[PDB]
């Protein structure tokens, strides 16, 4: 038995940060060796008990995620930061115990004309608590006149779209992110390593 790592790392759909999928890898063995023997991950920041030597570690729950973020903002995923994506769309806990694996996908998720099919929220008037999915296509108003079901004066749609083009350098380029978060619960350990 092998964990479905390939599905989470070699899929093609993924989703924007405003409504991000979550996968519960459990009751399987994950070959972590291939994670750090590929020379293809731009960032491999593990904050867990052991960024290397994940052998002899067994847990009762593995949480996998998948995000698409603009290049320069990838570093905002880590805990203790503050910014648009980090505070309004995804926030790690102070005692996070997993890994953040971010790679470049500029050769798959960008079109010459422009792929305006990626979104991120811009405001919530409430700082997000520990990571919690937030899907809401609201028409939040800004006073003045009522927003009668249309994005009119002082009416601001809360889902900005990324400016993805295959011309910008590292800064404004797509990155695919995986917040591979561990969670040791009271239940018996299931996901034992190699």
């Amino acid at each position, epitope marked *: 038995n092998l964990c479905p790592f390939g599905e989470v790392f070699n899929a093609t759909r993924f989703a924007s940060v405003y409504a991000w999928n979550r996968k519960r890898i459990s009751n399987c063995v994950a070959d972590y060796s291939v994670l750090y023997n590929s020379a293809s991950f731009s960032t491999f920041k593990c904050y867990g008990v052991s960024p290397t030597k994940l052998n002899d570690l067994c847990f009762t729950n593995v949480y996998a995620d998948s995000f698409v973020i603009r290049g320069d903002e990838v570093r905002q995923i880590a805990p203790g930061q503050t910014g648009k994506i980090a505070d309004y769309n995804y926030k790690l806990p102070d005692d996070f115990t997993g890994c953040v694996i971010a790679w470049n996908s500029n050769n798959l998720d960008s079109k010459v004309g*422009g792929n*305006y099919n990626y979104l991120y929220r*811009l*405001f919530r008037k409430s700082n997000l608590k520990p990571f919690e999915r937030d899907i809401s296509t609201e028409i939040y108003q*800004a*006073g*003045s*006149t009522p927003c009668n079901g*249309v*994005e*009119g*004066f*002082n*009416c*601001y*749609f*809360p889902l*900005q*779209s*990324y*400016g993805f083009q295959p011309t910008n350098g590292v800064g404004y380029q797509p990155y695919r992110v995986v917040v591979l978060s561990f969670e040791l619960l009271h239940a018996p350990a299931t996901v034992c390593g190699p």
Partner: antibody
Amino acid sequence: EVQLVESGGGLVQPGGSLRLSCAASGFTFINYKMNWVRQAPGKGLEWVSYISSGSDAIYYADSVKGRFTISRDNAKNSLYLQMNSLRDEDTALYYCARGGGYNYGECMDVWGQGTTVTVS
Amino acid sequence: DIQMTQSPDSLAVSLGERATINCKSSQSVLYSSNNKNYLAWYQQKPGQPPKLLIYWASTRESGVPDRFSGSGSGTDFTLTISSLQAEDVAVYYCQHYYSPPPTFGGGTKVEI
């Protein structure tokens, strides 16, 4: 970098039909609000148009209703102002401008070099 | 129907030092549950298009030095430039966007 450019305008007979084009890129028109603003030589500055992302809001001004319209193509990433039944009080330096998003307000931050229109 | 008035029509302030602009609106611009004012201040040199100075009536727009500062109550607004440099003379504009029909008050030509 991100800059706004304009095309069209010039000379026309009284009551003609004009199509002024404002084009730009680098900041994803899909998620910004654009406007047209008048600049009449040696009179002042005014506001005569409004649009939104999906063309939901078409707010006009006082001397606009029934004679101006605003449209925009996001595929080609530009907007067009169609201008019918002109009068000499319409002649001016027309400016295309952008919104601000949640930050700033509905204000104007990036302004194109503008165009000129006059009946004669 | 927001008829706007401004006092310094083509202001000329001692050829230097500071400069003061006063801008008032008939209907109050603030909002009940905002405590913020929806009026903005614009710069415009002759020729080139107008540029941002103040948004939300109290904040210095990023991209300009800290000389300029616009303040005022919920209905009255004033400028403070302090030092009148040799590359700042240009017309100043008010924008009133509390209502669906924003209107631009008028031009004040700050020069010499």
